[PDB]
Amino acid sequence: ATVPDLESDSFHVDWYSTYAELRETAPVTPVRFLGQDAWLVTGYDEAKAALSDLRLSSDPKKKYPGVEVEFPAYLGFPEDVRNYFATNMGTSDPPTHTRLRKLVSQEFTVRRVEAMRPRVEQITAELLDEVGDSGVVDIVDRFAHPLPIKVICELLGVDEAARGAFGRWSSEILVMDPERAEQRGQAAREVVNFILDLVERRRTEPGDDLLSALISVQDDDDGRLSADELTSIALVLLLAGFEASVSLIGIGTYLLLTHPDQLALVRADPSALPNAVEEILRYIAPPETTTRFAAEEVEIGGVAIPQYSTVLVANGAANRDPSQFPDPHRFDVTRDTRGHLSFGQGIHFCMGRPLAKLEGEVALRALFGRFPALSLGIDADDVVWRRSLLLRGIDHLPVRLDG
Ligand code: HEM
Ligand SMILES: C[C@]12CCC(=O)C=C1CC[C@@H]1[C@@H]2CC[C@]2(C)C(=O)CC[C@@H]12
Numbered sequence: 001a002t003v004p005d006l007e008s009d010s011f012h013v014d015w016y017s018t019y020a021e022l023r024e025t026a027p028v029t030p031v032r033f034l035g036q037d038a039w040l041v042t043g044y045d046e047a048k049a050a051l052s053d054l055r056l057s058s059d060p061k062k063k064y065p066g067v068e069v070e071f072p073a074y075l076g077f078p079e080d081v082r083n084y085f086a087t088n089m090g091t092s093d094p095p096t097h098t099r100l101r102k103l104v105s106q107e108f109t110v111r112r113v114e115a116m117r118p119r120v121e122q123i124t125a126e127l128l129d130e131v132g133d134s135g136v137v138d139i140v141d142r143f144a145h146p147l148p149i150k151v152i153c154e155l156l157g158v159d160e161a162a163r164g165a166f167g168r169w170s171s172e173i174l175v176m177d178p179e180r181a182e183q184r185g186q187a188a189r190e191v192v193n194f195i196l197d198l199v200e201r202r203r204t205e206p207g208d209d210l211l212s213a214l215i216s217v218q219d220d221d222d223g224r225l226s227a228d229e230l231t232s233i234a235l236v237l238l239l240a241g242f243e244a245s246v247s248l249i250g251i252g253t254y255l256l257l258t259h260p261d262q263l264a265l266v267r268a269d270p271s272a273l274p275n276a277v278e279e280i281l282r283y284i285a286p287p288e289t290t291t292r293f294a295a296e297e298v299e300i301g302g303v304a305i306p307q308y309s310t311v312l313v314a315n316g317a318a319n320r321d322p323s324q325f326p327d328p329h330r331f332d333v334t335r336d337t338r339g340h341l342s343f344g345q346g347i348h349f350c351m352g353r354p355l356a357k358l359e360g361e362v363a364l365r366a367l368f369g370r371f372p373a374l375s376l377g378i379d380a381d382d383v384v385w386r387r388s389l390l391l392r393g394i395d396h397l398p399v400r401l402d403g
């Protein structure tokens with residue numbers, strides 16, 4: 001009786017209360033979203049199990065007898081555009097996933113990330129030098145946002161008259177509003193056109209960047225990446241490379257400001273920063289929801305999910321499951337955050353974890369170390385949270401530098 005509609009304000013206003021209600025009733029339940037029926041998984045155990053079950057595919061390009069596969073993330077995307085966004089690690093199942101991840105991991109390494117620490121510190125310092133030292137500034141527009149973008153552009157060899165453009169496109173693709181569908185499909189074409197030009201430019205003039213590296217990358221047993229895989233991989237690395245990092249820095253600043261106790265704990269011991277980052281991700285996971293497609297009938301938590309169903313694994317809800325995390329609504333930077341699902345679970349585990357932790361640690365440490373009297377420019381209850389189950393974040397965060 002009464003299936004929940006994920007488009008309602010209950011999933012965007014104090015949404016975590018709605019998750020607890022649902023999980024209590026049934027960790028696995030049928031819902032409606034973007035006009036289609038789906039199953040949402042709010043339980044921790046149920047979420048881990050689902051992400052570990054390979055009968056739940058991550059490939060939207062797959063064709064099934066009399067079935068039209070529709071992953072919500074692709075609302076309004078023309079098919080040619082869809083395939084450019086969907087021919088990479090996160091959009092492939094083994095054995096394709098296996099080789100794509102192997103070829104990329106040869107170049108996208110911890111060594112390459114570590115060598116970037118000096119540059120990310122410098123960029124952080126510059127951005128902070130620019131905000132001044134007094135008044136109210138949107139910490140997102142002046143810090144949280146440009147920091148991750150500069151780092152990903154340098155890593156991929158993207159430049160000046162390009163950056164900032166994909167910011168607005170990214171902004172449109174982040175939300176699925178049925179009425180803005182084609183405007184969504186349009187920004188998507190632009191992102192693609194940009195990438196196509198970027199890769200060809202790099203083929204013509206290779207450098208020390210990661211993208212040049214991926215173009216030459218080769219393996220004896222796996223081979224090389226096709227033009228399409230290369231273009232799709234560059235697209236996801238660019239997009240996923242900065243968007244969630246923005247959410248981490250913005251939500252994190254917001255969190256520490258509203259929990260003075262935890263902020264004091266951090267300023268005191270810098271060695272407590274790393275776990276603070278983990279607790280911020282656990283508390284409000286940017287990728288609140290992850291999508292899977294049931295290639296076969298699958299039983300999740302005693303519930304049979306019919307074949308060909310769309311499954312929304314709510315990573316965000318699972319992180320606040322009381323049986324896994326006691327007092328899940330208490331933001332505690334000292335708690336064991338082991339096992340949260342914010343970077344995924346299983347084969348599709350986040351390849352970008354090292355870079356994300358680097359940015360969050362360096363950013364927040366630099367932010368709060370520089371502004372000891374930093375405070376929220378607005379009332380905590382007035383902070384506008386982005387309406388997206390795909391990726392949570394704060395688009396505007398006014399803070400007072402001097403207090
Ligand atoms: C705040 C940090 C981030 C969070 C919360 C995050 C979260 C995730 C999650 C939840 C997944 C799994 C998605 C699924 O199972 O369908 C994932 C996958 C992935 N992430 Fe991250 N991520 C972050 C930053 C990054 C960065 C900086 C990059 C690097 C360019 C990146 C690259 C990827 C890629 C390529 C995958 C696909 C992995 C695969 O399919 O094999 N991520 N990430
Ligand atoms: C989790 C994630 C990473 C960081 C970020 O900022 C936003 C997202 C949401 C979309 C995810 C992406 C990871 C790569 C994924 C799985 C694909 O291959 C298609 C969907 C896409």
Ligand SMILES: C[C@]12CCC(=O)C=C1CC[C@@H]1[C@@H]2CC[C@]2(C)C(=O)CC[C@@H]12
Nearest residue numbers: 073085086170171173174239240243391
């Ligand atoms: C999460 C994300 C990151 C950067 C950004 O600016 C906006 C978005 C939302 C659309 C995501 C994209 C990551 C790549 C995704 C998952 C695809 O492969 C299709 C939909 C698309």
